[PDB]
Ligand binder design. Structure first.
Ligand code: HEM
Ligand SMILES: O=C(O)c1cccnc1
Length: 153
């Protein structure tokens, strides 16, 4: 697909849709995560000692938002420029993932959790062309973070 002018137009449009509801889309996101992999719970400070995923924990929202922003930004960057640019941020990310005891087999957990979250976010407007466009953008960004973790470990 590549990211045509037509495909990027599709990712931007769908990200704008996600931001429109951070406490929902981010709590869903942690549930999709614990559905796919339960043990992941012990990883997160704000999830430990708890029995369910807190719905209004600011720490938790701030946390999940930041993750989706990072995947959008990556898609536009692909259409316009043709690539994903690795900065300070992407590298610090790689450090903290290792402190917290996170591995690569964890990544398809958080991907499916994000494609499923966006399919849920865009509903009937969903196209093969759009799925293809976020898939392309996650893959391309994960390729970069995994790359930095392996560097932070
Ligand atoms: C392209 C995919 C990913 C992106 C964009 C991303 C982004 C981030 C960011 C931005 C932070 C720090 C948040 C803060 O300062 O507020 C963080 C922390 C963390 N990440 Fe991820 N991440 C990704 C994949 C993963 C995966 C696959 C896992 C494993 C399940 C994971 C587990 C964690 C943990 C345990 C922390 C520490 C949270 C705490 O303070 O207790 N991440 N990540
Ligand atoms: O909340 C976090 O810090 C988080 C969630 C998913 C992936 N990475 C980090």
């Amino acid at each position: 697909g590549a990211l045509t002018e037509s495909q990027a137009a599709l990712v931007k449009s769908s990200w704008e849709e996600f931001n429109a509801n951070i406490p929902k889309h981010t709590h869903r996101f942690f549930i999709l995560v614990l559905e796919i992999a339960p043990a992941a719970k012990d990883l997160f400070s704000f999830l430990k000692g708890t029995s369910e995923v807190p719905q209004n924990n600011p720490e938790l929202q701030a946390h999940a938002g930041k993750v989706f922003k990072l995947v959008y930004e990556a898609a536009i960057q692909l259409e316009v420029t043709g690539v994903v640019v690795t900065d300070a941020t992407l590298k610090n990310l790689g450090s903290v993932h290792v402190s917290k005891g996170v591995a690569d087999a964890h990544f398809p957990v958080v991907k499916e959790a994000i494609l499923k979250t966006i399919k849920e976010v865009v509903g009937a407007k969903w196209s093969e062309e759009l799925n293809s466009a976020w898939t392309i953008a996650y893959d391309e960004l994960a390729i970069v973070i995994k790359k930095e973790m392996d560097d932070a470990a």
